[PDB]
Design a protein around this ligand. Structure first.
Ligand SMILES: [Zn+2]
Lengths: 140, 204, 173, 37
RNA sequence: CGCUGAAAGCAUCUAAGCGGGAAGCCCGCCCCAAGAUGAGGCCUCCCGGCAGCCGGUAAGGACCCGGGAAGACCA
RNA sequence: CGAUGUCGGCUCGUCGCAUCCUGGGGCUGAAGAAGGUCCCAAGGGUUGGGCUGUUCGCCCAUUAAAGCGGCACGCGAGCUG
């Protein structure tokens, strides 16, 4: 009686409202659905988590003074190339990249992890071009 | 933002107000637009300028169709003037006027695998007092075990020039309408005959 | 003794409460006060009040601030406000230029100030200027910038002074 | 603005505030103006 | 450095809020840049037999050759 | 210790800020100018020479200034010795 492995399953699209939800918590549930660890047929070594689309990423909310005290930094490899970016500016420019950074901070690494991050699609604002994919709305 | 294609014909000083104002002479026009970069079509504003004309028997079908969608004769070189919607269909030197400030973008003369002195003006080493075989080397290039590597962007040998270069805030000494020639004070990047782009200066 | 206090609403003043914000339209004009939703607006004709839901520090704070603030607002749309300035310093004075106020207080040039929206610059003389409007904070803001232009001088009465601003300058040479 | 760690009243007019997470010894005397740091 | 302002009748630049404010930061200037594997966008050109597979192909390209302020080679 | 080349100078720099100048400000025993001190500030700059192996320092002349340090008291498979 070997442990069961499922066959390949079509990923079920899932829409998620970025508005009104906390950054960390929402990113948590997003990562959870992304892994497919909501499915009884779950298996680690294969990306069978669901495709996820989010809208109103700008409409995310964050507790405390994290608007400014949270500094998304980057590194160019160049001396003094540490580019600190506060959370506010990062909202004004790339809020979708904010959620990308937060959820990517929670995914398991490795090529499976990167493909999983490909499996996610953020859209700041209320719209997205995936109606053909039938994005199932799912409150969290 | 006004601009025009052009070619560096050479340099020369001339006399205005008892000053031998050195200028570079630049055959700019005429420049026919071939495609206008529109935001609805391309997400921004710009035009596409042909200069100089090209042999019809030396043009591929794709470009030929590109001039059929346009109306211009087949033309050798084609560039974009960002954020420039010329009402006219062939920009010429008339868009500028002598005394107007411009910025010129060209490819400086390719100096090949430039040494480190000529490329970055490193002092090199002494010529005597025992300098062993190092008269033009950069000396040290880093630090010891901490951090024990080479930072990115450390100046070294490589291709000095042969690159898109823009000198800025030049002055239109004089325009030459009949010739499509333009007179700009100072020097322009690139060799004589090397293509260039003349643009209004972004200064103020 | 202050959120305890009742806020009279002498018409013609339309105290319009919205969720977390009031819209008061008096005779002098109109405005809106954004307000903490935690505080209730006791909308009674003639006198409106505020009911702090608890007595935490945040609720006596927000209670007093909300009450006195909205009272300032209704007094704004109902009367507007004024804040004078006694320009001093020899040869220092101003003069209204249409809406913009020119002021020359000893630079390499004059200094012109533009009234934002209601903000009017009254020039009783070149030496004294009034800046009035419905807003209480904004009068102190624009007039604040005015006094910021040529601050008081520590050694001479040579600088933009508030009306009632006590003139305390130290001795010099 | 005397900066220090042990900011304190000097005269009775020395009023103290916790302005923006810091403690300020504000008073009429500009000499008495103190910033804890 | 402020304006409004409660907590705390007063006052308080702060607690709500708003403003000003530096060779500083971001942008703005210049250059690189879609291996940006998120591989972007726009224009123009091409059209059979045994997800494929073969075929010569179209567009086009390469080799070759004359070179070149392009260049170590390559490009 | 079956090797981690040791001072100094040269080249090349990169970084910290406990900032010398340049930017902003507070107080003053700040009349103005020049100042003193402290706060914010690391973008850029921070000279040439005489002496000495020297670093250091003194001195000459300047400068807005002529910063202190870290980087194996940086840097010898880069030079010197
Ligand atoms: Zn005191």
């Amino acid at each position: 009686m070997k442990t069961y492995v499922p066959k390949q399953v079509e990923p079920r699209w899932v829409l998620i409202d970025a508005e009104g939800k906390t950054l960390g918590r929402l990113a948590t549930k997003i990562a959870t659905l992304l892994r497919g660890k909501h499915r009884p047929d779950w298996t680690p070594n294969v990306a069978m988590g669901d495709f996820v689309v989010v809208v109103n990423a700008d409409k995310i909310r964050v507790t405390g003074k994290k608007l400014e005290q949270k500094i998304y930094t980057r590194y160019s490899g160049y001396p003094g190339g540490l580019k600190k970016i506060p959370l506010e500016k990062m909202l004004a420019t790339h809020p979708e990249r904010v959620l990308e950074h937060a959820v990517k901070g929670m995914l398991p690494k490795g090529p499976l992890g990167r493909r999983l991050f490909k499996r996610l699609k953020v859209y700041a604002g209320p719209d997205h071009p995936h109606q053909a994919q039938r994005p199932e709305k799912l409150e969290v | 933002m006004k601009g025009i294609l052009g070619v560096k014909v050479g340099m020369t000083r001339i006399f205005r107000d008892d000053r031998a104002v050195p200028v570079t002479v630049i055959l700019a026009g005429p420049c026919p637009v071939v495609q206008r970069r529109t935001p609805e079509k391309d997400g921004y504003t710009a035009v596409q300028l042909g200069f100089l004309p090209q042999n019809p028997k030396r043009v591929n079908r794709p470009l030929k169709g590109h001039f059929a969608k346009a109306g211009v004769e087949p033309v050798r070189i084609l560039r974009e003037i960002r954020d420039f919607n010329p009402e006219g269909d062939t920009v010429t030197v008339e868009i500028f006027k002598p005394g107007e400030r411009v910025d010129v973008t060209g490819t400086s003369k390719g100096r090949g695998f430039a040494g480190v002195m000529k490329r970055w003006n490193f002092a090199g080493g002494p010529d005597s007092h025992g300098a062993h075989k190092i008269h033009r080397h950069p000396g040290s290039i880093g630090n010891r075990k901490t951090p024990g590597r080479v930072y990115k962007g450390k100046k070294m040998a490589g291709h000095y020039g042969a690159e898109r270069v823009t000198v800025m805030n030049l002055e239109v000494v004089d325009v030459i309408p009949e010739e499509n020639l333009l007179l700009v004070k100072g020097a322009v990047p690139g060799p004589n005959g090397g293509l260039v782009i003349v643009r209004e200066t972004k200064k103020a | 003794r202050i959120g305890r206090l009742p806020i009279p609403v002498p018409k013609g003043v339309s105290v319009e409460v919205a969720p977390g914000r009031v819209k008061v339209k008096g005779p002098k004009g109109e405005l809106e006060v954004p307000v903490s939703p935690e505080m209730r607006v006791v909308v009674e004709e003639g006198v409106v009040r505020v009911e702090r839901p608890s007595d935490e520090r945040r609720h006596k704070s927000l209670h007093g601030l909300t009450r006195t603030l909205i009272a300032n607002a209704v007094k704004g749309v109902s009367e507007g406000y004024s804040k004078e300035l006694l320009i001093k310093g020899i040869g220092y004075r101003a003069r209204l230029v249409g809406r913009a106020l020119e002021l020359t207080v000893g630079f390499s040039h004059p200094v012109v100030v533009e009234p934002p929206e209601g903000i009017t610059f009254e020039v009783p003389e070149p030496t004294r200027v009034r800046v009035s409007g419905i807003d209480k904070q904004k009068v102190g803001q624009v007039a604040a910038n005015i006094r910021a232009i040529r601050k008081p001088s520590a050694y001479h009465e040579k600088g933009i002074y508030y009306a009632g601003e006590p003139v305390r300058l130290k001795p010099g040479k | 603005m005397k900066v220090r760690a042990s900011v304190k009243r000097i005269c009775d007019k020395c009023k103290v505030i916790r302005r923006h997470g810091r403690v300020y010894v504000i008073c009429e005397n500009p000499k008495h103006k103190q910033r804890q740091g």
